[PDB]
Amino acid sequence: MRVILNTGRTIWQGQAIESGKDLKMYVDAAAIIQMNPEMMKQLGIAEGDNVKVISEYGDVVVKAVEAKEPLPEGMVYIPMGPWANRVIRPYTDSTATPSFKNIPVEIIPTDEEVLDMPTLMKVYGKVGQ
Amino acid sequence: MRVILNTGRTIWQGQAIESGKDLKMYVDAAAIIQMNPEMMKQLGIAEGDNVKVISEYGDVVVKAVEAKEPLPEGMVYIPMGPWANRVIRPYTDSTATPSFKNIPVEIIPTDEEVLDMPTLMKVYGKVGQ
Amino acid sequence: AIGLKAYPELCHGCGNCVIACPVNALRSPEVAGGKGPTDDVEIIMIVEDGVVNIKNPDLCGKCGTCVESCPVDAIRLEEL
Amino acid sequence: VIEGKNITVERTNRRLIFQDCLCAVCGLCGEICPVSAIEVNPTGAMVRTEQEKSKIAIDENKCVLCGMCSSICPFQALDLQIDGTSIKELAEYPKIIKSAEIDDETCIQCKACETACPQDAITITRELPERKDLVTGEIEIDKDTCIYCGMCEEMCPVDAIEIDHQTPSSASPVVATDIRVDEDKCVHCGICKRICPVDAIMQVCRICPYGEYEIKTPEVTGTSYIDPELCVNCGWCQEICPVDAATVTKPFEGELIIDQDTCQACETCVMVCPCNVLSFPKPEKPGEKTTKLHKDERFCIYCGACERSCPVTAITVKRNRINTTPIRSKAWKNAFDSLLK
Amino acid sequence: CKACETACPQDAITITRELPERKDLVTGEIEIDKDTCIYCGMCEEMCPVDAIEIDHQTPSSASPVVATDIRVDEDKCVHCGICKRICPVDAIMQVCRICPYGEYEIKTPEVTGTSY
Amino acid sequence: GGNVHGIYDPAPYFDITPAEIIKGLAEVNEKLQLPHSIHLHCNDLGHPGNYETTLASFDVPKNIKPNPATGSRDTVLYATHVQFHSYGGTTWRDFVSEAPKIADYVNKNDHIVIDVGQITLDETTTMTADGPMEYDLHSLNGLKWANCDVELETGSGVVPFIYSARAPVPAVQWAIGMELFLLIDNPEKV
Amino acid sequence: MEYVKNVVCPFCGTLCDDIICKVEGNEIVGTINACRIGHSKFVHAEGAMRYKKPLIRKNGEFVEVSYDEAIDKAAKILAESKRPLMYGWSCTECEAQAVGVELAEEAGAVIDNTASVCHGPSVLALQDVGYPICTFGEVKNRADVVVYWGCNPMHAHPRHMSRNVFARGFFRERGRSDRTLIVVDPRKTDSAKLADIHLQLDFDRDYELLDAMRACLLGHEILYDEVAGVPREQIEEAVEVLKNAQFGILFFGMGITHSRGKHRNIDTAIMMVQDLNDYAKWTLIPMRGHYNVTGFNQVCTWESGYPYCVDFSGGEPRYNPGETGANDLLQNREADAMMVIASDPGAHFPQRALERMAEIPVIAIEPHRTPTTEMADIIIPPAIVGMEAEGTAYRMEGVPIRMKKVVDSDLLSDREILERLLEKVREYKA
C-alpha cells in the first residue's frame, strides 16, 4: 500500500533518547509506525505486527502501532530516529535541510524482525580509520 | 458487527434450485453471505471463511463471499433459501407476507461448519405423523 | 464518591492541570502565572519526577477544570 | 427502579420520579429533605465531565416520600405523584410561585427570546410573505430573438432565469432548447435586460409608481410557546423583548456576592449557571481590563449551583425569601425556612 | 456568446468573456439605523441576494444582546426594496435611483473577451 | 501596535505621560548621583514637524540640578542623535530643516549636551528600541523588518535603510546634521 | 536529601528555569516541575551507557585511552584535513560554542549546528523578509490569540502551553479562557485536541494556504473555492480571527521547516505576521528545538557575522546554506572528516549522509552511547551542561539564562576539551 510518511516527535521518544539510545526503551519508542485502525485492518495487521517500509531512498522494518493522535487518511507516522531516517528523503533542495516529512512510501506486512540500534547502524558499513 | 441483512435472488442460486436443492451446488450458491471487500477487511475475514449470523429470530452459519454487486455501506446479502430464512423477520404485520428483506443482524467470524441442506432442517425437529 | 485520580503512566508532565486548577492558583502566585512552585506551598497536585502527583486530594472541589485541560486523559474525576 | 440515569422510587400509591436531563445539580433537594435521603454529586464534575452516575442518589430505605424535594426543585427535575397524579395539581401540597408568559397580541415575532432563552424553552414561529408579493413588474423573453449566450442567466442575482442547455446534435443543431423566467423569484432589478446583447428581454419595473396598490403591506403572523418544564424563570425573555411582551416572576429572592480576588477564572460557575447570569467580559480595546467575573442578577434565581460548584468558594448566594402557596404543615414550614440565608 | 465553445465536438475552442460587475448595472442608496434595529433577522432572511449580514450571538450578562452588528454589502444589493418593506421598526432607508438617474449613474455594458 | 504622539500622550493602561517619565527619571538620575545624565531619545522620532516635540522635551528636566558624585558633569540632559528630531514641515513633501531653531536652543541653554547622529549617505542598518518607528520605516521602504518586545521592559526594531545622496530626503537629513555641528557655537555641548 | 531550586532544564528551547532537582549523595535522583522529558535527562536510567573514559576504534574494536591521546589523535585528524566538518553544538553551552568557532577558524573548517536540520530554513527566511518576535512574558501577559503552526508542543515542548497559554497574565488574568487557541496540523495531535480552532489542512500545502490568507488579508478575492483542503469561507473566517486580535502570537515548528517549500513556508508566514500589524498587533516565535540551539547561532553570528553553515576554508567567513551545510558536505562527499559535539547525526541524519560518515574520520564528544558513537572513530566523554557544568544558554526567543552546575563530575567539560583540542591543532599546523 502506498502511503505518505510523516515523522517527528513523541513524548515517549523524547523520554527514550534522554534515558538512552542504547536501551530497549528506544526501539519500542522509535522503531514503530503509527497507523489509523482502519488502515491496519485494510492491511490485515494488528498492533505488534511488523511492517516493511520501502521508499525511493531506503527500507526499514518497524513495529505497527495504533495512532492515538489520529492521522489523515493515507498518512502514517514514524518518530524521528534512525529507522525513519532509513527511508525519508535526503535531498535538501540547496537549503541544507533534508525532507524529513511527508514522503511517499510503500508499506507491506512482514515477518522479518525489527533491527535494534547497533544492528541497524551496521547497514551503513562503518570502516575504521 | 451490526449490519443490515438483505435477501433475494442470484442466477447461481436459481441454477442451483432447478438443478437440485439436495446438491452441493445449492449450499455453494445459497449458504453464503455477500459482503463489500472493505467490510471483510474490517471483520478480518477472507473469501471462503465462515460467518455466524445472529438475529432476534434465529442464527445460521454461512460462507463469506465478495459481493460483485456492490452493497451500500453496512449491508450484506444472503440469497433466498433456508439459511437466510433462519434469521430474517417472520412477522407479516397482518399482511401474510414476512419481512424477508432489510433485517438488523449481528455477524461475527466463526470456525464452525456450514450445515448442508438436510442437516440444517433437523434443527426444526420434524416429528413424524 | 467522585474524586480526583491520576494516571501517571499516561502523563506528559506538561503542567496544564497544575496551572489550570483554581485552588492551586489561589495559593501559589507562581502557579497562577504558569510556573511550577518554587516556594513551599500546599496545593492539590504537582508534577514530580516528570508526572502529575496528587499531594492534597482533600482540597479538590471536583469542578472539572483540570480534566478539560488534559489532552491525554491522565487526570480524571471518577469513583474513588 | 433505575433506568438509564433516571430514578423512580415507589411505595404501594406514591411515586417520586427524578429526571436526570432536567437536573441542574443545584443541591437544594438534598438540603431540604428531612430524612437526608438525597446525596448530590459535585456540580462542576456533573456538568463539565463525562459521568455514568446520575446527578443524584436517593436512598429508598429512608425516603418517606413526603415530596418536599419535588416541591422545591426549580428545574422540574423531581416529581412525586399520588394515585397517580402529580402534586403540582394537589392544593394540599405547598407549591412555589413562579410564572413566565408572553402576550401574543403584543409579540411581533422577532425571535430574540427564543435565542436568549438559556434553556431553549421558547418556541417562536413566524410566517413571512412570499417574495413575489412584495415586488411588481413585467418580464418576458422573446426566445426566437434569444441567441442563448447565457449572460442573463449568469448575471441574474436571484437565479430566476433558467436555460435548457444541451450539446447539439445533427437532429437538434442548437445549444439550448428553451429559456424561462421564474416570476416567483424575479425581483425586477433590470440587470438581464441591460446585459442582453440582442435586446431579447422586455422588462418593466412597477414598484415605485404602482407599489402602493400592487404590493400589499406585509402582515407577519406567528405564535409563541413556553415549555413549562424546561422553563426556569430567569427572566431573559422579559429583559430581551423589544416590545415588553414577556413577563416573568421568580420563586426566590436573594443576593449574589462575588470575591474577585479569590476567583481564579476556572469558568466552572459560568458553565454551571443554568440562567446565563455569569460571564467573562472581553476587553473592548487593547490594554483595557475587565471585571474578572461579571454577574447580572436580573437573570438570577438563587438556586445556588454556582456557589456549590466553586472550589475556592469565591461565589456565595444568599436567599431572603421563598414565595410559596400557604403552608400549614409545620414540618414543611421549617424545612423551607432552613434554606433561607 | 460561447455557442461554438459548447458546440465544438473536439473541445478545441476557448471563449473568454469579462462581464460587468453587478454594482455597476444598478444604482441606489441604502442605510440601516442600527440603533433602531432590534435584530429580528427578517431582512436577512428575505434579502434575495444575501446582501444583508447580521453578527448573531448567544447573549451573555456582559453582552445582553442577540446580535452585535448588521451590514449591507452594496456590491451585492440590487435595490429591490424588500428589506425596507419587511422591517417591523422601519430601521432601513432604501431608495432605488435607476429610473430618475439611470442614464447617468449606470454605464452601458461593454462585454470583452477573446477566442482561441 | 500603537504609539504616543507628543510628550503629553499617555500609554495604554499605565496612564503616565512622556513628560512625567522624563522628569521623574531625571530626578532619579541625580538623586542617585549618577556620573552621567539621563540619555534621551525623544518621542516622534523621524517625522516631519517633530522639532516642537523636541524643544518641549528639552525643557522638561531643565529645573533639575545636576549632582554627580563621580566626575565633572554639569548638565542634566543628554539628547542623542537629535538630527532625527530636528524636522520641520508636516509631510515628507513639504519637509524642511529646522536645525537652526534646535541649534539656537542649545546655544542659549546650559543644561543640555547633544550628539547629532550624522547621516553618512551609505546603505546601512537601523536598529533601535523605538519599535513603532521601525515598523513605520518598514512601511515606507518595504524592506525586511525585525522586532522584539521584551516583557515588562522595552521593545525594539531593525530595518535596513539606503541613505542615497541623490534622494531628496536623505539629502536634507545630511544637511540637518551638518547644520547642527556648525551652528552650535560651543563644541563643549556636542 | 538535598533540594536544589531554580535549576534550568537542559533539553528543549522552552528552557524552563524553575526546576527543582532532588540530590542524594553527589547524584540527581529526582525532579520537581520538570516534564517527562526534562526529568529523563536529569536522572540516570538503569542499564544506560555513560562513558567513563575516552575510546578509540583500532580498526574494528574500541579501546579505552587517556584524554591526551584521544585529543591528540583528534587534533591530527582535523589539522591534516582539507574539508573538516565541525557539527552539533546545540546541546552544550555558549562558551564551548565560542571555542568551537575559534577552532573552526584555526582548522579552516566548516562549523554548523543543528539549525541546518531544523529552523535553518527560518534563518534563511528571516534573513530575506524579517523577524517580528517577542519574549514569552509578552505572550503570557498580552496574548489574545495563540497559534501553534506545524508544531506539537504537548510532545515536543511539554510545558510550553502551561506557561504561555494556561498561565494567568497581567492583561490576561483568566489564562486559558482569555485566549483563542489555534493549531494548524494535518494530524489531530494532542496539542490540536486542546485548540479552539484546528485547521486540519492538507500536508505540504501550507504555502498555498498562507498565500490565500494573505491575499484575503489585503482585500483580494481568493481564486479557488478550496485551498490546502480548507474551503474558501473558513480561510476568510480565520483571517478575521487574526485581524480582530488585540495581541497575536504565531508559534511555528517543524511542520513548515521540513515541509515542501521549507524556508519559503516560513517566509510567507513571517510576512503575513508583518502585514497583520496594520490591523492588529502580531508577532511570532520559532519553536527552537534544543535548549541551546539558539545560543550557538547567537555566538557564531556575533563572532563571525553569520549564524550557521559557516565556512572558514578561505580564512574569511563565508556563508551559503545548500553548499556549506552539514548535510550538503556529507551528501555531496565534500567533507573528508567530521567532528560531532553535543548532537546525534547518526540517529538524525538521512541515509545518504550516513553513507558518507561511514567513509570518513568521525570524532564524537559525547557522554552517552548513540548511533553516532556507533559510527565514530574517537569518543570523548564530557561533563553534562546543566547538571555537571555551567554556562550560558539561549531560550527560543533569545532570552539568556545561565545553566547551573548541580553535581560534580570527574570528566572534563566541553569547553576544556575544545581548548585542549585547539591548542594541539595549532601545534600540528606549526
Ligand SMILES: Nc1nc2c(c(=O)[nH]1)N[C@H]1C(S)=C(S)[C@@H](COP(=O)(O)OP(=O)(O)OC[C@H]3O[C@@H](n4cnc5c(=O)[nH]c(N)nc54)[C@H](O)[C@@H]3O)O[C@H]1N2
Ligand atoms: N519528545 C521530544 N521532544 C523534543 C525533541 C525530541 O526528539 N523528542 N526534539 C527537539 C527538537 S530538536 C525540536 S526541533 C523540537 C521540534 O518540535 P516540533 O516543531 O513540534 O517538531 P515535530 O514534532 O517534528 O513536528 C511537529 C508537527 O508538524 C506536523 N506536520 C507534518 N507535516 C506538516 C505539514 O505539511 N504542515 C503542517 N502545518 N504541519 C505538519 C506534524 O504532524 C507534527 O505534529 O522538539 C524538541 N523537543
Ligand SMILES: Nc1nc2c(c(=O)[nH]1)N[C@H]1C(S)=C(S)[C@@H](COP(=O)(O)OP(=O)(O)OC[C@H]3O[C@@H](n4cnc5c(=O)[nH]c(N)nc54)[C@H](O)[C@@H]3O)O[C@H]1N2
Ligand atoms: N525523521 C526525522 N529526522 C529528524 C527530525 C525529524 O523531525 N524527523 N528532526 C531533526 C531535528 S529538528 C533535529 S534538531 C535532530 C535532533 O538533533 P540531535 O542533536 O541529534 O538531538 P539529540 O539526539 O537529543 O542529540 C543531543 C545529544 O547531545 C548529548 N548531550 C547532552 N548534553 C550534552 C553536553 O553537555 N555535552 C555534550 N557534548 N553532549 C551532550 C545527548 O546525549 C544527545 O546524544 O533530528 C533531526 N532529524
Ligand code: SF4
Ligand atoms: S478538580 Fe477542580 S479542583 Fe480538584 S483539581 Fe481538578 S481542578 Fe483543582
Ligand code: SF4
Ligand atoms: S495530567 Fe494531563 S495535564 Fe496534568 S500533566 Fe499529566 S498530562 Fe499534562
Ligand code: SF4
Ligand atoms: S434540585 Fe431539582 S435540580 Fe437542584 S438537584 Fe435536586 S433536582 Fe436536580
Ligand code: SF4
Ligand atoms: S421524598 Fe420527602 S423524603 Fe423521600 S426525598 Fe423527596 S423529600 Fe426527602
Ligand code: SF4
Ligand atoms: S421577543 Fe418579545 S417579541 Fe421578539 S418574540 Fe420573544 S416575545 Fe414576541
Ligand code: SF4
Ligand atoms: S441574454 Fe439576451 S440572449 Fe443571452 S440569453 Fe439571456 S436573452 Fe437570450
Ligand code: SF4
Ligand atoms: S430581473 Fe433582475 S431578477 Fe428578474 S430576472 Fe432579470 S435579473 Fe434575474
Ligand code: SF4
Ligand atoms: S424565562 Fe428564562 S427560561 Fe423561562 S423562558 Fe423566559 S427565558 Fe426561557
Ligand code: SF4
Ligand atoms: S468563581 Fe469559583 S468558579 Fe466561578 S470562576 Fe471564579 S473560581 Fe472558577
Ligand code: SF4
Ligand atoms: S447564578 Fe443565580 S442562577 Fe446562575 S447559578 Fe449562581 S444562582 Fe443559580
Ligand code: SF4
Ligand atoms: S464565435 Fe464569437 S460569437 Fe460566433 S459563437 Fe463562437 S463565440 Fe458566440
Ligand code: SF4
Ligand atoms: S429588519 Fe429592520 S430590524 Fe429586523 S433586522 Fe433587518 S433591520 Fe434590524
Ligand code: SF4
Ligand atoms: S435591497 Fe433588495 S437587495 Fe439591496 S438589500 Fe434590501 S433587499 Fe437585499
Ligand code: SF4
Ligand atoms: S426606481 Fe422605483 S421603479 Fe424605477 S426602477 Fe428603481 S425601483 Fe423599479
